[PDB]
Amino acid sequence: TSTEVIAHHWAFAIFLIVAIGLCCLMLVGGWFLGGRALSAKFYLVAMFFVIFDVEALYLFAWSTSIRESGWVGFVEAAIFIFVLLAGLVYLVRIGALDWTP
């Protein structure tokens, strides 16, 4: 409820509103003005991205509290990263990540 916090909230709201309005108004002006007269490897890559992004979010949560988690948290994240790297090595070696076989 600080005045700095509410001022920054208002500034963020005005930033988003004015930015989206600027883009929309620029397209509106562009439209109104002026006269008139597949392979499955894409799925594989996107699916690998989704899986590795969820494992990335796990590491995202770990990274902000490494000191509070101590060495036992380091050991757990090391097991997590080793399993993730084993899966990555598996995908590379079986040709799943090889774009040109």
Partner 1 sequence: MIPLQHGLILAAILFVLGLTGLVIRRNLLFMLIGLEIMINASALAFVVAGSYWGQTDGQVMYILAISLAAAEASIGLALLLQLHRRRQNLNIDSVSEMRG
Partner 2 sequence: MTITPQNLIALLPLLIVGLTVVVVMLSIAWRRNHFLNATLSVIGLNAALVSLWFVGQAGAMDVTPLMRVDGFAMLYTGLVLLASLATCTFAYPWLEGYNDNKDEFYLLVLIAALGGILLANANHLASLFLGIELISLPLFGLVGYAFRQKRSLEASIKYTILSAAASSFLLFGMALVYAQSGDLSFVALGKNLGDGMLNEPLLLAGFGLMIVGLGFKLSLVPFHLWTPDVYQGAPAPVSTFLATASKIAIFGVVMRLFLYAPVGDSEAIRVVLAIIAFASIIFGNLMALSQTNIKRLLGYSSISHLGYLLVALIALQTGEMSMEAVGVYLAGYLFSSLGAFGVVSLMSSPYRGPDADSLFSYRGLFWHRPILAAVMTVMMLSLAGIPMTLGFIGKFYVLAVGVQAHLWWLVGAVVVGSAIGLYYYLRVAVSLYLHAPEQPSNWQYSAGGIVVLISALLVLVLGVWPQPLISIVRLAMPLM
Partner 3 sequence: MEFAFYICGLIAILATLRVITHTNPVHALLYLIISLLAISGVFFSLGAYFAGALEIIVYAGAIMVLFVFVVMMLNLGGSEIEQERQWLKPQVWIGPAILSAIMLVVIVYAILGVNDQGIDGTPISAKAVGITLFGPYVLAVELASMLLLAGLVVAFHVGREE
Ligand X SMILES: CCCCCCCCCCCCCCCCCCCC
Ligand Y SMILES: CCCCCCCCCCCCCCCCCC(=O)OC[C@H](COP(=O)(O)OCCN)OC(=O)CCCCCCCCCCCCCCCCC
Residues near ligand X, by CB under 6 A: 70-72, 75-76, 79
Binds partner 2 (CB under 8 A): choice among 41, 77, 87, 97:
87
- Nearer CB in complex with partner 2: 38/72: 72
Question: Of 6-14, 36-44, 46-54, 83-91, which segment contacts partner 2 by CB under 8 A?
Answer: 83-91
Alpha-carbon Rg for the chain in angstroms: 24
Give, as one character, the DSSP assignment of residue 65: T
- Binding of partner 1 at residue 58 (CB under 8 A)? yes
Those residues whose C-beta lies under 8 Å from the C-beta of residue 40, and which sit 6 or more positions away, are none
